[PDB]
């Protein structure tokens, strides 16, 4: 199928409380596989999935050094941004970076990414062409001019098209048991009386992977989007996700209502009813 | 694996 690799980085300054907190995590699709945290006692990048543990001490050495370098780069970058935005040295500020690549079924690059944010807003992004920049403001435009002179887009392109894709392919293979397995939702409908006149029908989807799913309620076939309470897809803590959709139904009219589940791990799309 | 990052804002 189609897959993705991402590295997320967050630096948070803390004036008067030492150097900024740096936390980076790596993902393949919806699976966390590496992490580094600067406030751990002797920080190293650590595995978080079984298929990455097989990498040699030299992988972990290099990964760790890259993480330390990025933390340090971020510390300086955070000082720089106080200048660009004419800010006081008093407050806490946040620098975020994401980069990675998407591959298709064949394992060819579909799209590469590299983007930064300052204080939770867009700062600068590498465009889909992997050759030009979108700067969100005049401060980011100063970064753009420096990165244009230093030919940074060309360096990111070389990586996003080469190593990112090659190592993602490698991880998909080594992690083929899990990364290439979709777990279908386990589904049921529950009935929650509100009064003698109404009850809540709640349609559960549990234990699914990857996170992407569609839950909708129908009444007689028509769509109840306007009346459906749909909670955010949430992690179960074991690699799988949960979600539910709920409608308030007139007591006795429960069998007019059908819940519909689509998810890639299902042999066929599901249709469910409250089963008293 | 990661990309080394060799530029500043």
């Amino acid at each position: 199928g189609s897959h993705s690799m991402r590295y997320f980085h967050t630096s948070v300054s803390r004036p008067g409380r030492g150097e900024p907190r740096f936390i980076t995590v790596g993902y393949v699709d919806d699976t966390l596989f590496v992490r580094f945290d600067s406030d751990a006692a002797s920080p190293r990048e650590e595995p978080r999935a079984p298929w990455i543990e097989q990498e040699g001490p030299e992988y972990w050495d290099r990964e760790t050094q890259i993480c330390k370098a990025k933390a340090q780069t971020d510390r300086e970058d955070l000082r720089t941004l106080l200048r660009y935005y004419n800010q006081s040295e008093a407050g806490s500020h946040t620098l975020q970076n994401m980069y990675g690549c998407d591959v298709g079924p064949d394992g060819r690059l579909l799209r590469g990414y590299h983007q930064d944010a300052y204080d939770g807003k867009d700062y600068i992004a590498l465009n889909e062409d992997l050759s030009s920049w979108t700067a969100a403001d005049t401060a980011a435009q100063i970064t753009q001019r420096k990165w244009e002179a230093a030919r940074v887009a060309e360096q990111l392109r070389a990586y996003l098209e080469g190593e990112c894709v090659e190592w993602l392919r490698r991880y998909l293979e080594n992690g083929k048991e899990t990364l290439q397995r979709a777990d279908p939702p386990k589904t049921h409908v529950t009935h929650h009386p509100i009064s003698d006149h109404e009850a809540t029908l709640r349609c559960w989807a549990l234990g699914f992977y990857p996170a992407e799913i569609t839950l909708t309620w129908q009444r007689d076939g028509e769509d109840q989007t306007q009346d459906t309470e749909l909670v955010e897809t949430r992690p179960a803590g074991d690699r799988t996700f949960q979600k539910w959709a709920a409608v308030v139904v007139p007591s006795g009219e429960e069998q007019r209502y059908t819940c519909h589940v689509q998810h890639e791990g299902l042999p066929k799309p599901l249709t469910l009813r409250w089963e008293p | 694996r990661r990309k080394w990052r060799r530029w500043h804002l």
């Binding site: 997320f8 967050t10 948070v12 936390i23 995590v25 993902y27 966390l32 992490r35 945290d37 806490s92 946040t94 975020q96 994401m98 944010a117 204080d119 939770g120 807003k121 867009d122 529950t190 929650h192 709640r202 549990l206 909670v231 955010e232 949430r234 992690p235 179960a236 803590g237 074991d238 949960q242 539910w244 | -």
Partner: protein, 100 residues
């Protein structure tokens, strides 16, 4: 500056069965900045040794975290999550309801 308030969900890993060991989750998401205080409570008191995921964020840059702990649900024991964030004048408590 940009500040976003946390969404909060409290729920179990597996469907709740009284007397059976399970995991209590508090999932906080869509917040900015990333500094946040989360407690899981049993009958109004802080559960010790609660673990959490490593800070990550969604496409819109807003953060998410999962706080979790081993627990054995019963009929009478009441669980909850208490969340404090800059966007909140006081900590938000969300009770665990096994139907949600």
């Amino acid at each position: 500056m940009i500040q976003r308030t946390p969404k909060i969900q409290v729920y179990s890993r597996h469907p709740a069965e009284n007397g059976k060991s399970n995991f209590l989750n508090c999932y906080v998401s869509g917040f900015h900045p990333s500094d946040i205080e989360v407690d899981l409570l049993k009958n109004g008191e802080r559960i010790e040794k609660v673990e959490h995921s490593d800070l990550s964020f969604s496409k819109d840059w807003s953060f998410y975290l999962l706080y979790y702990t081993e627990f054995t649900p019963t009929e009478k024991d009441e669980y909850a999550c208490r969340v404090n964030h800059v966007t909140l004048s006081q900590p938000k408590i969300v009770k665990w309801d096994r139907d949600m």
